[PDB]
Structure 1
Amino acid sequence: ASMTARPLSELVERGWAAALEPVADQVAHMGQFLRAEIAAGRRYLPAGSNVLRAFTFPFDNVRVLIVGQDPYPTPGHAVGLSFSVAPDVRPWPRSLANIFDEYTADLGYPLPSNGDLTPWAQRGVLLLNRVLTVRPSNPASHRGKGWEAVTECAIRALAARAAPLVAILWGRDASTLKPMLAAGNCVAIESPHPSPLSASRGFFGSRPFSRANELLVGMGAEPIDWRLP
């Protein structure tokens, strides 16, 4: 359960545990960081058992990578899959409402029934953030505290697989992963982040879902079924 106390082989899916071996010590250090935050009287999100949740879906099955900045800052929202919320959450966070507006515009599907993105994760979409924890109410508060090396390692490992990869990089912090995607089996879509602060700079109209599927087909891979219930 605890990333200070237990190894990657217990915390994440088998392929991910091997993929993340270069950062095994760093993940334990992040567990120590979180312990120190609590000792100091600061909290973090998502819940400890969810921090590495994106790495519990199989590494070998990832076809598309979505990367945001850091988890939702409001207690009760972040679940360890970027942008997702529990199926009983309403209203939707503003960034997610914006994502879903673009989803309907791009794909023509009706608005989803809820904000649970687990179907995407179950269909080969990795829902990552550049940084995997945040202090409540304080976006970007864990920037530069050691998660970047972990998520860098994850992207490098995905990019090294003998497989096509499409990355969707939402926002500035996600965009720092672009250099690691240089190899010919990988292609990146970059746009402004879907938060209200930046969505009108190019997130709306970006059509990332249909573009990712055109890219997958062009590499000989199966497209994602993006349809949410």
Structure 2
Amino acid sequence: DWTTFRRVFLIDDAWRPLMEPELANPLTAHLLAEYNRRCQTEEVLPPREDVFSWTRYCTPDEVRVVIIGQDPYHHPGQAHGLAFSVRANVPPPPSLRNVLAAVKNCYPEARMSGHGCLEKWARDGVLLLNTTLTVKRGAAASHSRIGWDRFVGGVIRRLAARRPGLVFMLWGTHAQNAIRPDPRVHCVLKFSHPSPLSKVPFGTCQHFLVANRYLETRSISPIDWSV
């Protein structure tokens, strides 16, 4: 089962202890069933090889910051398995441009590439994790009810218990209500969604600055937010 699951999804082994306990849940078996019945009659994004690419850039112990997203971008070519991130040959969507805007404001000394591929951050310990891992091409929130969130929740719960001192950036009410980490053990940062509709301009968000100031106090080095 773990060897087969890990097979199908090309999941990295470092994540075995946090994920394995979840397969044994009957609700997980059905989730995988619902996923497989769907790939047969619908174009599902992102590709199977990318659905768990977040387990591949750093180990659970290397994680420093966890940023939560909703579902993956639904136009082909955009999503590659990370929250907010877009492949390098795709223009950064509106919410990403604001996230990247908030970064340059906190760190004006930063040389940004103008691009939106966040794999540099992932390698540094920033876990960009959606709560709904797949979406049907062209339909938003199409797989939002098949159970990805109960699963992802299970993994985050374990991660938070295994490694104290994680910084969580929860953007928008949905993300805030979804993940409820212990605030005495972790730095929980909340803000309005980076979307341009938000009442407060996200470019005024200083989470990247506070996250690093926190990491400084626990003796962990700061993340280089430039991308």
The TM-score bracket by the shorter chain reads: 0.7 to 0.9
Counterpart Cα distance in 2 of 1:123 and 1:24: 28
Structure 2 equivalent of residue 7 of structure 1: 5
Structure 2 equivalent of residue 219 of structure 1: 218
CA contact under 8 A between 2:61 and 2:163: conserved in structure 1? no
Counterpart Cα distance in 1 of 2:194 and 2:61: 28
**1:16-55 matched pairs, under 5 angstroms:** 16-25=15-24, 26-39=27-40, 41-55=41-55
Q: How much does 1:183 deviate?
A: 5.5
Change in CA separation of 1:173 and 1:145 when aligned onto 2, cut-off 3 Å: farther
> Which one-letter code corresponds to 2:196 in the other structure?
P
Counterpart Cα distance in 2 of 1:71 and 1:206: 23
Unaligned runs of 5+ in 1: none
What SS does structure 1 have at the residue aligned with 2:203? coil
Structure 2 equivalent of residue 99 of structure 1: 99
Q: Which stretch of structure 1 is more off in the superposition, 94-103 or 181-190?
A: 181-190
Please report the TM-score for the alignment, with normalisation by the length of structure 2.
0.87
Counterpart Cα distance in 2 of 1:48 and 1:173: 26
> Which one-letter code corresponds to 2:212 in the other structure?
N
Structure 2 equivalent of residue 152 of structure 1: 153
**1:125-136 matched pairs, under 5 angstroms:** 125-136=126-137
Counterpart Cα distance in 1 of 2:106 and 2:124: 19
**1:49-128 matched pairs, under 5 angstroms:** 49-56=49-56, 57-89=58-90, 91-108=91-108, 109-128=110-129
- Any idea what the Cα deviations from partners look like across 1:12-41, whole Å, max 9, x if unmatched? 2223111112322555543322221233x3
Q: How much does 1:204 deviate?
A: 3.0
Please report the TM-score for the alignment, with normalisation by the length of structure 1.
0.86
Q: How much does 1:4 deviate?
A: 10
Q: Which stretch of structure 1 is more off in the superposition, 152-161 or 218-227?
A: 218-227
CA RMSD in angstroms comes to 2.3
What SS does structure 2 have at the residue aligned with 1:159? helix
Equivalent pairs counted in the alignment come to 222
Change in CA separation of 1:192 and 1:137 when aligned onto 2, cut-off 3 Å: farther
Q: How much does 1:64 deviate?
A: 0.6
CA contact under 8 A between 1:69 and 1:171: conserved in structure 2? no
